[PDB]
Amino acid sequence: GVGNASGDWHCDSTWSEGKVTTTSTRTWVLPTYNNHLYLRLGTTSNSNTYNGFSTPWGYFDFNRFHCHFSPRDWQRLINNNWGLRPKAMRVKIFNIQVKEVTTSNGETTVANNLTSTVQIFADSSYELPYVMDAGQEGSLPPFPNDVFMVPQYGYCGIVTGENQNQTDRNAFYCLEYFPSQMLRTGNNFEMAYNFEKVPFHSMYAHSQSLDRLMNPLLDQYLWHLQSTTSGETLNQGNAATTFGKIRSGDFAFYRKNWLPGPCVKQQRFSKTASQNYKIPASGGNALLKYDTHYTLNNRWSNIAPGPPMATAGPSDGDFSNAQLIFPGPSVTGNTTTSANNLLFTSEEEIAATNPRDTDMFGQIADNNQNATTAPITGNVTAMGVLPGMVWQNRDIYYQGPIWAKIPHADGHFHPSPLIGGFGLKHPPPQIFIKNTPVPANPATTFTAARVDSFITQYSTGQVAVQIEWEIEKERSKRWNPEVQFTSNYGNQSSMLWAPDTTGKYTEPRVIGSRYLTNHL
Amino acid sequence: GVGNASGDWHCDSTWSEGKVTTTSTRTWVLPTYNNHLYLRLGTTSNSNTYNGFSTPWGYFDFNRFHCHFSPRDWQRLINNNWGLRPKAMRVKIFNIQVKEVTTSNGETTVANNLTSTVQIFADSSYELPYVMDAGQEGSLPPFPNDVFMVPQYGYCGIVTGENQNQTDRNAFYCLEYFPSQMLRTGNNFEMAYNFEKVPFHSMYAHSQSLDRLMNPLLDQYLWHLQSTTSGETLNQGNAATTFGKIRSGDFAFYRKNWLPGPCVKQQRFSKTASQNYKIPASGGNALLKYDTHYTLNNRWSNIAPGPPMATAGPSDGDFSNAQLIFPGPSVTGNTTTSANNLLFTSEEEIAATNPRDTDMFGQIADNNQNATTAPITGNVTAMGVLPGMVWQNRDIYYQGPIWAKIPHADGHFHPSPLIGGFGLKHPPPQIFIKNTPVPANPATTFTAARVDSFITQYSTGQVAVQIEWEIEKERSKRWNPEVQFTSNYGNQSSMLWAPDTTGKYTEPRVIGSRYLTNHL
Amino acid sequence: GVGNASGDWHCDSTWSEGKVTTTSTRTWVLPTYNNHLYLRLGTTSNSNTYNGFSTPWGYFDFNRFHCHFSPRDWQRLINNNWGLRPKAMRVKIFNIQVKEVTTSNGETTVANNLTSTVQIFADSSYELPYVMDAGQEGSLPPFPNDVFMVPQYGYCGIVTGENQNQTDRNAFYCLEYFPSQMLRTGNNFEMAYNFEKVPFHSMYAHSQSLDRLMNPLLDQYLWHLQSTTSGETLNQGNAATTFGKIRSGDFAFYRKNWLPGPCVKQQRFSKTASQNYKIPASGGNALLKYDTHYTLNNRWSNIAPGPPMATAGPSDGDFSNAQLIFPGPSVTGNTTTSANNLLFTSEEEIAATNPRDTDMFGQIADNNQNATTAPITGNVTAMGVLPGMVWQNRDIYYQGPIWAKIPHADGHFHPSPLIGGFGLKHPPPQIFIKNTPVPANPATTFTAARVDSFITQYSTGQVAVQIEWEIEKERSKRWNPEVQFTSNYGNQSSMLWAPDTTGKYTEPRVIGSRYLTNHL
Ligand SMILES: Nc1ncnc2c1ncn2[C@H]1C[C@H](O)[C@@H](COP(=O)(O)O)O1
Ligand SMILES: Nc1ncnc2c1ncn2[C@H]1C[C@H](O)[C@@H](COP(=O)(O)O)O1
Ligand SMILES: Nc1ncnc2c1ncn2[C@H]1C[C@H](O)[C@@H](COP(=O)(O)O)O1
C-alpha cells in the first residue's frame, strides 16, 4: 500500500568465529537520463578513441570495500585474520518514492505522483556488458548518512583501428529488451546471489625473504665455480679455474628451488618536482609515450598498475605508475601540483617474494664468454612466468574495489584483477533501474511520430546490501608482537575518520589489509 | 490498489526447436478524441469519394512484424527456417494512469486524478468493422523504448456511386452499445486468443525454374511439328511439314505438366526522372488513369501491389507499382524527388514460378493460320487462374503487416492478403480503449440539453503482447552454402540498426524472409 | 478502495425466443440544488395555480422507451411480435466521483475530494410522491455516449380553489427523514425489482373493422322496419310501414353484438395557418377555453390526449389536441411557427375499433317521432363506457413513456396511462440521490444558527439499468406480406438516426409499435 513502508533501514556487522556478515543501507536519487533515449557515442582522439552508447538506465554498484565495512570493522578484520573471501550476497530496494516536478516560473515545485513506476531488473545471465567492475565512481558512499546519485549506465563498443567508427561486429544492447520488474510506492525488489569458491585473499606479509629460506647454519652439498682466475682485478690473474663447495654465508650462491617473480618494468618519478626530466602531457612526447604501455590494435593503452610488483613505500620521495593514487582529504579540485596532498598505495610487503617496479627483474648472461672476448650481461625488463616462480598478488584496500569480472575469453592466466580484488567468472550481477516515462499532455489528433513530450520526474528510495564473508583466523606461532594498524593519530583539532564542524566526511589514509605476519 | 503496479514490463523472445515465442511491452498515451463525440464523415472527390464516421475511441494495433521481432531475432528466424505461421496470442494492458490537466493561463498544469476510469473491451464477435488490417500507422513502434500514441478509431461506410452520400444500407456502429470493462489505476485488462490453422508462410526461394524440371540428359517421347517449310525466311520455302521427336536441348518445346502464373500487367516507371513520359498527378490525365486500376461501382480504385508477380530487383533502375515502397532512413517529409531515398521491396525470388510485373503473361495464337493468311499472336496481359497453374505468394517483410481479415463474403479465392501476410477468417480482435468522460462544474439549475462541458484528461499505461509462433526448420540436402542475410554494412560512422547521437532510431533496409533455398 | 472501479460499463440487448433483455449504461452529473435547502413553492395564476416544494435531492428516471432500446432493437421488436410487457428490472450506480471546486478569481478550479459522500436510497414503500411518471424531461438520453444531468426532485401539493394557498391537508415530505445509503468513491449501490403481471401491450393493427365481422355472403335472420312511407322524399308518400328481412349488403343495418367506443370530442385545427378561426393564447378567450377541458375544483385542466380515439394520420393537414406532438430534428427553440417542423403521433390504426377524435361518437334519436312532429337526432359528443363496448388503447412510442403509477384511489377504471404505457399499482421506485453537504471553514466561537457556508461540490458517475421484457411472437395465418417499419429514407447527405458532422444526434421520426396485423 501507499501508506506502508516496504523495508526497514538496517545497517549492521555481525562477527562469527569463522564468518563476518556485513549489512548496510543507503538512500538514493535517480534522475531521468538522456531525456529517455539511448544515444550513440563516439569520439576519435588518437590514443584514446572510443565508441559506445549512453543509456537512460542507471545501476547500483557496491564494488568498493568501504561500502560494507566501517573503518573500525575493517580494522577488526585485518588485525586478526590471515585471509578473507566473500561467500554470498543479497540486495533489496525499497520505499520507492516517485516525484513529479511542476517547474513553475522562477520557482520549481515538486510533488509526489503516487501512481508512477520505476523498473528494476538485474541480470544474472550476464547478457549485458559488465561495467560495475573497473575503476569507477558510483559505488555507495562509505559514510552511511550520505545520499547518493545512481550512476547512469553506458557501455563501450569494440573499436577497430586508431580511428573510431563501427564495424558490423559492433553491437547494440537495448535494456528495454529485457523483462524487468515494475514498482510503485509500496512495491519492493529483492534478489540474492552466491559467490563462487575463490582463493582466500592473503591478508599477511611474508616474514621471510624468498631468496633465503635455507638454514643459515649449514651449507649446501653442491659446488659452484667461484673464479676463473686469481686476484680481484677483472682482466688479470692466473689462468686456473677454481671450484668450491658452497659454504654457509655465500647465500647469494646457494642453488635455490624457486624463482621470484613475473615482471614488467615501470618508469619512476620523483615526488620532488625538481628531480624529473621535463615531460609534457601533450604533443609528440607527451608523458604517455614514455610510461610503460601495451600496444593494442594500434592504440596505446597505458598499463594500469601492472603485474604485481614491489613499489616504494608511501612516504618515499619517489613513486611509480605501478602504485594506485587516491585523492586524500585536503585536495579541492580535479588537479593538484603537490603530491603531498595525495595518498599512495604501496606494496613494500610484496618485496619479499617478487621484483621491484622501478628496478629490473635481474640480469642474464647475454653472451658466451671466451678468453679473447669478455662476458656481457643483459638487463632484463620484462619477464613472463617461468616454472618455479612464486609471487604475491597486489593487496586489497579499504577503498579499493572488491571483485571484477573475468573476461569471457578462451584464455586467462591467474585471474586476479590487477587493480586488486577477487576475480569471478560470474560476479555479483549489475542491478539496473530506470524511471518509467510519462507523457505530457498530448495532441488531440493522432500523429505517428514517437512522443517526445514528457513530464519531469525523478525518484528516490533506499537500497540495502548484505554480504556474508568467510574469513580465517591467523593461528601463528610467532612469539614477538605483530604490527597492527591502529590509528596513532596525533592530537587533532577535529578528530580523524569522523565528520567535522563543516559536517564533511573524508577518509584520512588509504588502508591495506596486510599487517599480520606469516612465513613462507 | 493505487500504490501497487498491476503488471511488469517484460519484452522477450524465447526460441524452441519447433516454436519461437515473442513478447514485447510498450508505453502508450491516449488523448480524448473529438471532444467525446462521434462525427459523421464524408467528402465527395471523384476517384476518392468516401463516407464514414470518426470515433471517440482508440485501438491497439500490433499488425506489423517488427512489433514482435528484434532485428537479430528476425534474422535468426529467416536464415534458419523454411516456414513460419502464428499459433496463439495474448495481450494485457496495465498501470493505467489517468491524468487531468489544469491548463492555467500561459502554463498548463497536469496532475493525477486518481478516481478516473478508462474503458476497454475487445470484440471477439467481430461485430465492429475491422480496420487494424490494412496499410496503416498505429502499430506499436519497433524500438522498445519509444512511447506511442494510441490511434483513433474511425470506420468507412459503403459508398454508392461516384458521389458520396448515404443510402439506407449505410450503417452506424456505436461503441458504447457494447459492454466494456472499466478500469482505474490498479485495474488491469487481459485477453487471450488462438490463431486458426493456417498455411505456413514460405520463407524460401525456389532453386529451380518451373519451366524446366526435366532431366537435362533425356528427351521426351513425344513429337512436335517443328516447321511448315524449309529455310529460315518467314514466307518462303518448300511446302512440306516436318515433325520431330522432342530431343534434349529443345527444352522450350518440352510439353510440361504445369502453367506458371495468374497475372495482371503493371505499368513500369524508371527511377531516372528523365526516362518517363510526362504525366501529371491531377487533371484529365493524372497518373491514376494510366496505372492499372480496377473499376468498382463507377470508381477507380488503383490496384495495390497486385496478384503476386515477379518484380525488378531493388537496385534496378526501373520499378513498378507492384512493389511496395517504404520511406527509408534519410527522408524528412511526406514527399521526395529522388527515389534513391526510398526502400523498394522486390519479388525477384518469385520469378522462378510466375510472370513478371511489367512484362506480359505470354502470347497466344489469336488466329487460325492459313496458306493465304499469316499467323497472328495476341499479347496476353490479364490471366485468370487456370488448371495446373502454380505460383508463389508475395513475401512477408520485417516491417510488413502480419495478418489481415478475410472479407465476409460468399466467395474468396486463395486468401492471402495481397500486401503480404496470413489471411484469417477470424483475426486477432481489435482491442478498443477510451477515456471515460468527466464533467466540468455544471449548472445549479437543471437543463435537459446533453452536457458539453468536460474536464480535460488523457491517460497512459503499458500494453504487453505475446505471440507464440510455430516454425519449421529447413532440413535441406543442398550441398553448397546458402545465401543468408547478414548485415555486410560498410564501416559506419554511427552504426546501423541502432539509435544514433541524436538518439533517433530508424530502420536501414526493408527485409524479407526468403534467403533460404529449396527446390520445386 | 479509491483505486478500484466499482462496476463495468455494459450496455446490451440479448434476444430470446420468448423474452428480450435490455441493458444500458450512462454517465451522469449531479449539481447541488437549492444550495442545500428545501424551498416552499407556489404561484397563484388562474387556470394554472399550483403549490408545492423543491428539493435538494435529485432522481434517476428511465421512463422513456428509447432509454433501453436502440432504434434497430425497437425495429426488431415491433416487426416481429404482437405483444410485449415488462417483467423485471435491476439498477446499479457506480464509480462515484465527488468533485470539489476551488473557484479562484477569474478561473474556477476543480479537484477531487476523495472523502466525500453522496447518498442514495430508493423507496419501495412509495411513501414519497411519485413524479417519475408523467410527461417530463430527465430520463436517460437515448444515445449512449451522451452525459446527462440528474433531474432535481420537486413535488406538487394539493391546491384548493382557484387560489393557491395551503390548507392543513397540504403535507410536507422531507427526504432526510428516510434512511439512505452513503457512498464514497469505491462504494456502489444496487437494487432490483419485479414488475407485476400486466396485460401485454398490443403491438398490432386490426385487420377487420368492428362494425362488420359478419359473413358478407349471408344475411341476418332478423327483420327491421325499412320505411314508414314510399318514395325518397322526406315528408311525402304513402302511409304504410314496411318491414324487410335484413339481407346481404344492408350491412349498416345488421344488428351487431358490440358497440365501438368510449369517447370524448376534441376540437380540430388545421396545420395550414390560414384555415383556423383566430384564437389568442391569452385573455378572456385564450385557446384554452375552447379546447376540450375538464373542470376540477374550479380549475380548468386541459384534457391530455384523451380517451383513446382515432386521430388524423400524421401527414394530414388537420391535427387534433388528442395526438401527441414531439419536437422533430430541425426545431431550434421552445417555440415554432410552422408545424412542418414537428412530429405528430397518430392513431389511425385504432379507427377500426373506436370513434374519431374530431368527429362525433354517433347520433341518437333525441325525440319521439310522430305523424305531426318530425324526428330529431341529437349529436353525441361525450360517451361513457357501455356494456358491449370494445376499444383499443393508445399505442406506445419509441420515445414515449413506458409506465405510470396508478393513483392511490378507491376507484380507477381500465388503468392505462392515457399518454401511453403500462399502468402499475407499484411501479419501478424512484431512486433518489444527493451530494452530502460539506462545510466551509467555520467560526471559532460557537453559534447556534444553522451553518450556511458550504464548500462547492458536484458529483458524477455511471448508472446502469437492466430490464427483462417478456414478449410474444406473432403466429398469424395471414397470407399476404405485412407492413413493417423499415427506414425507406431517401439518399441522405448525412445519414439518419446517426450522429452527424456537427456530432449532434437527433431522432428523425416518432415511431409506434403497431405495424403487424391481426384480425378481431
Ligand atoms: N582472485 C582470483 N580469482 C580467481 N582465480 C584466481 C584468483 N587468484 C588466483 N586465481 C587462480 C589462478 C590459477 O587459475 C589458480 C591457481 O591456484 P592456486 O591455489 O592459487 O595455486 O588460482
Ligand atoms: N495466407 C492464407 N490464409 C488463408 N488461406 C490461405 C492462405 N494462403 C493460401 N490459402 C488457401 C487458398 C486455398 O483456399 C487453400 C489451398 O491450400 P494449399 O495447401 O495452399 O494448396 O489455401
Ligand atoms: N396498462 C394496464 N395496466 C393495468 N391494468 C390495465 C391496463 N390495461 C388494461 N387494464 C385493466 C383494465 C381492467 O381492470 C382489466 C380488464 O382486463 P382485460 O383483460 O383487459 O379484459 O385490465
mmCIF file of C-alpha atoms and ligand atoms in Angstrom, chain A residues 198-199 393 406 414-417 421-424, ligand 1:
data_model
loop_
_atom_site.group_PDB
_atom_site.id
_atom_site.type_symbol
_atom_site.label_atom_id
_atom_site.label_comp_id
_atom_site.label_asym_id
_atom_site.label_seq_id
_atom_site.Cartn_x
_atom_site.Cartn_y
_atom_site.Cartn_z
ATOM 1 C CA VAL A 198 37.551 -18.299 -4.646
ATOM 2 C CA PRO A 199 41.067 -18.250 -3.186
ATOM 3 C CA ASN A 393 49.126 -10.537 -5.522
ATOM 4 C CA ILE A 406 36.870 -12.291 -15.611
ATOM 5 C CA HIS A 414 45.961 -16.292 -12.763
ATOM 6 C CA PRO A 415 42.903 -14.112 -12.747
ATOM 7 C CA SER A 416 43.243 -11.555 -10.148
ATOM 8 C CA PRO A 417 42.230 -8.130 -11.064
ATOM 9 C CA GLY A 421 40.323 -7.905 -5.594
ATOM 10 C CA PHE A 422 38.742 -11.259 -6.362
ATOM 11 C CA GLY A 423 38.400 -12.482 -9.920
ATOM 12 C CA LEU A 424 34.995 -14.002 -10.611
HETATM 13 N N1 LIG D 1 41.395 -13.712 -7.313
HETATM 14 C C1 LIG D 1 41.367 -14.833 -8.041
HETATM 15 N N2 LIG D 1 40.211 -15.175 -8.649
HETATM 16 C C2 LIG D 1 40.179 -16.290 -9.386
HETATM 17 N N3 LIG D 1 41.149 -17.161 -9.631
HETATM 18 C C3 LIG D 1 42.286 -16.798 -9.012
HETATM 19 C C4 LIG D 1 42.476 -15.686 -8.217
HETATM 20 N N4 LIG D 1 43.783 -15.644 -7.738
HETATM 21 C C5 LIG D 1 44.343 -16.714 -8.257
HETATM 22 N N5 LIG D 1 43.496 -17.448 -9.051
HETATM 23 C C6 LIG D 1 43.742 -18.657 -9.840
HETATM 24 C C7 LIG D 1 44.917 -18.626 -10.788
HETATM 25 C C8 LIG D 1 45.014 -20.105 -11.114
HETATM 26 O O1 LIG D 1 43.983 -20.405 -12.064
HETATM 27 C C9 LIG D 1 44.659 -20.776 -9.782
HETATM 28 C C10 LIG D 1 45.863 -21.352 -9.076
HETATM 29 O O2 LIG D 1 45.507 -21.830 -7.786
HETATM 30 P P1 LIG D 1 46.457 -21.501 -6.549
HETATM 31 O O3 LIG D 1 45.695 -22.162 -5.467
HETATM 32 O O4 LIG D 1 46.427 -20.010 -6.377
HETATM 33 O O5 LIG D 1 47.768 -22.193 -6.773
HETATM 34 O O6 LIG D 1 44.004 -19.752 -8.979
#
